[model samples]
Target: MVILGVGYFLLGLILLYYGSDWFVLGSERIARHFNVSNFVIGATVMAIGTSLPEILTSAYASYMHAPGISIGNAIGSCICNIGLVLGLSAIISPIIVDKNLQKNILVYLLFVIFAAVIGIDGFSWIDGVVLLILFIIYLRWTVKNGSAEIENNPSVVFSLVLLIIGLIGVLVGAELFVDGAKKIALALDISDKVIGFTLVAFGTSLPELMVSLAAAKRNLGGMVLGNVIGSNIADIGGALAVGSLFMHLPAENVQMAVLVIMSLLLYLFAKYSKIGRWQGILFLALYIIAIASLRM
Candidate 1:
């Protein structure tokens, strides 16, 4: 089991590295071809692509009546995206400002906040539908406004193909990594909450981390920021909505509170202050402390 775990972990790392390169490159090409803005590319295509794993995992967990795992994975993945993915981007270099990015940030916040409020009572099909509605509205808004004045480059079929291939790679890589890590954690006597909240959470969120990191390296600031915020939006808007459709997810206040506070911090920092290397370090520190405190 340990050997297999190591193998899976190593394999996941490789895929994440190469897959992210393919994802960012191909997505950027597509964006350029479509004459779409970078913000739109990151917010829509890249965001949904990276979020696929979380949506599927949480949705299935809900179907199986495991609300704890479902909700935990969704909220935990959100924190992972912001604190880990976005934090690393900043650490690499100052994330560039997109003045228009702030509004989407607020919209994303509302979706999560709404999820928390409904979670206070519990998730139902009705709640799921509403969340789904919110997600649809967001998509409409993004599509309607995401147009650019840049000249169009004809769609290169190859770019779209590569983007699909990269998306598949990241999803499959995350699944293998999480399964391996979960087995090892169980063998080591780790509690389910720790396993569920941290290892699995981070594993599923690896795609966003990898994609955003790749984007940062290429200095695609819009992609980095869009991927992070978009993933957060999809967690509740897309993933949670799908999960709730399967069955009623009884909301846990603990998870809800954790996600809420983390997101609020992200908003305050991104909205009010300039994010730089130091701010990135601070986010990383906060994430580490949060996980460590969970163990204690």
Candidate 2:
């Protein structure tokens, strides 16, 4: 039984990784055909594409009546993206934080505050409506500010096919991942919250890690920061919101505190206009400490 659980878990992670990769590739191509700005593409298409696993997994968990996994995965993925993904990217190449990116970060911070407040009692359907509305506003704001002219050319049919396949893959992966996680949690006598926050969150965050690392290697510091920030927004506003619509998600104080602190740390670093390697080390250390403390 344990072996079967592990198999499901591994297969789910594999599908999530490749599925998101293909999704991003196809979406980018389609966006280019529409002449979308690079920043918009990174912030919207890439960000949402990378976040699809978290979104779908949390929603599925909600449907399965596992509130812990639903909420934990959403919040955990945010922490992983910032501390692990961005931290590693900064270590590879120091990220230069721009004013536009700072504004977006501020927006994300506001969303975090709103989420924390609304989730005090627990996330209900009303909270989900508010979050989704806020998300739409944020999306509009991002598009308005990030627009720029670009040459348009692409094969829509191929891109659409990849997009469809990727969506199907992500859907299947989410079900497998959530089921396996539940089994493993039961077998190991671990709380579903812990399993979702650590193992499941990390697994679903692989796409953001890969994308950020590649961007960092190319010295596209803005892309890395933008992607992480945007992905976090999607996780909170899109993923968590959707999950809450399906089921009430109890707010775990400790997890919420960790998320808030991590966001603050990122904000502070961005204030300096650069995330140096030393800061990266600090982020990584804090992430490890956060994970250990959560398990304990």
lDDT of all predictions, in order shown?
Answer: 0.79, 0.77
- Pairs that collide in candidate 1 are none
lDDT computed for candidate 2: 0.77
Alpha carbon deviation, residue 55, candidate 1 (Å): 1.3
Most TM-score-accurate candidate: 1
Question: Compared with the true structure, what per-residue lDDT tens digits does model 2 show for residues 1-296?
Answer: 67778888889777766775565566556666766644566677678877888898889999999877888888888888878888898899896677876787788787887788788898997898898888888888987777655542247888877766765566566557767777887788775653345577877776777666656766767667778888888898888989998999997777777888888888878876579798898889989898777852
How accurate locally is residue 112 in candidate 2, as Cα lDDT from 0 to 100? Answer: 85
Stretches > 4 Å off in candidate 1? 1-5, 149-155, 180-198
Q: lDDT per residue, candidate 1, 1-296, as tens digits?
A: 77787788778778878888888999999888878777789988999888888898888888888776787778788877777888899888676565577777777777778788888988887887888788888877876677765552235887987798888878778777777776677677674864465565677788898889888899887788878877877888788878888888776677677778777776676788856788788878877877777631
TM-score of model number 1: 0.88
